[PDB]
Structure formats: C-alpha cells, structure tokens
Amino acid sequence: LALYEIRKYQRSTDLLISKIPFARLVKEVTDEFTQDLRWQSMAIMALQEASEAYLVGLLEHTNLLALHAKRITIMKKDMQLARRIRG
DNA sequence: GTGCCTGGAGACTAGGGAGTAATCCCCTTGGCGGTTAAAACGCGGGGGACAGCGCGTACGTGCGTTTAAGCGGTGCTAGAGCTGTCTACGACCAATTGAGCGGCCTCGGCACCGGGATTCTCGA
C-alpha cells in the first residue's frame, strides 16, 4: 500500500499539521525572543501554512536529491545541501 | 431587494514638464597587418564511472495502549478603534556662503640599467 497515502493527502488540499501544539510552539519562541504577546489565530494558521509550504518545498527538493545519489531513503546530508540552494 | 453616506466626475485658472531647432563631440563601429598565445586534431591510457554481489538492518506494516487532544460553552480578561482637543511641526522662497568637481601639477615604489668587488684565464 504505497500509492494509497500519496493520492490521499495530495488530493485533499487541506492542512495536516496541528494547531494548538503549534500555538504552544509559537508561545515558546515568543518567550524565547521577546514578554507574552497575544496571537491572532489567522496569524497562527498563516505561520502554519508558510511552514507547510517551506517543508514541502524542502522535501520536494530532496526527493530528486535522493535518487541522484542512487538512494531512496533520504539522509541527514540531504537536509544539509538542499539548504545550499535555498539560502 | 433596499438603502443612505461619500468618493467620483469635472470645468477654470496658475504653473511646471515635453520635444522640436541646434550644435558639439566623443565614442564607436569597420577594416588592415602581425604576432602570438590560445584553440583545435589526434593518440595512448589509466583512473574513475558503472554493473553486480554480500549482507543485515531498519524501516514497511500491523497490533495493544495511552494520551493528549479535539469539538462545543461560556465567563474572565485585557487588548484594538474613534471621536474631541490641543500641541508641535516640517516645508517655502530668498540672501549669503561652501565644498566637492574640472583640470592641473608633485611624489614614489617597481622594473630596468650601470659600477665595485669578486671570481675565473690567460699572460708576464
């Protein structure tokens, strides 16, 4: 059952990652950088969408990097050289 | 569907950009020779690309379990507008000055060029 989840999560054009643990994470990083700040939920789902787009871009860049080095399972070095062509 | 508040539409008068005369004029585009360092043809090769095998392991997959965690309510709490009210607050045209450009003249280490001392050959 390899092609089942690829045709399921891609066609369903909604989100997949969590919201309230991501709210706890953004509260953690604002405790790291700032003083508590109130956060609009539209801003939290915008950060969620931007993180999702950045992650799917990084994984679709490492997809061909896996098959380039005669591999299928991606490695830790694949998330060390895909950043070189991402800044 | 119904609707009232307000940006949109628009002509008249000062008032500042546009492209057409005008002319330098500097940069460029085009070609002739030379000479030379780089581009091209070829040839043996060997070191690196590539197919295949050994393997083992660790993730593909499945199952018991917990584990937050999601959907719905609602008060608690504390952060986002809006109209008054008053203060600052940055610009406009003009005399005076200024300070960095147009074109000029002075140094100074780098590469080339000649003597003092040293070494090599012959002569005395």
Side-chain angles (χ1 to χ4, degrees), chain A residues 2-75 77-87:
Chain A
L3 212 66
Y4 278 74
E5 321 293 326
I6 318 181
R7 305 168 294 113
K8 176 198 193 76
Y9 304 130
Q10 213 164 17
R11 297 187 207 181
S12 49
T13 56
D14 53 354
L15 311 178
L16 191 146
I17 44 183
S18 87
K19 173 72 179 198
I20 317 291
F22 188 66
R24 293 182 183 174
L25 187 45
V26 75
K27 279 161 221 201
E28 179 170 42
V29 68
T30 49
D31 289 13
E32 282 156 11
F33 271 95
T34 70
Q35 266 207 354
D36 60 327
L37 310 179
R38 274 176 73 185
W39 275 106
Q40 288 191 4
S41 197
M42 283 70 73
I44 305 307
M45 76 151 288
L47 267 294
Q48 188 174 30
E49 162 64 55
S51 84
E52 173 73 47
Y54 197 69
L55 281 184
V56 68
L58 205 54
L59 267 70
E60 82 179 3
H61 282 181
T62 53
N63 264 300
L64 260 172
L65 286 164
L67 273 75
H68 188 209
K70 290 163 191 164
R71 301 164 154 162
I72 284 188
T73 319
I74 58 178
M75 312 307 193
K77 316 172 302 303
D78 302 317
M79 300 307 186
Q80 282 153 28
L81 313 172
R83 203 171 141 83
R84 299 292 296 162
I85 313 100
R86 288 290 278 268

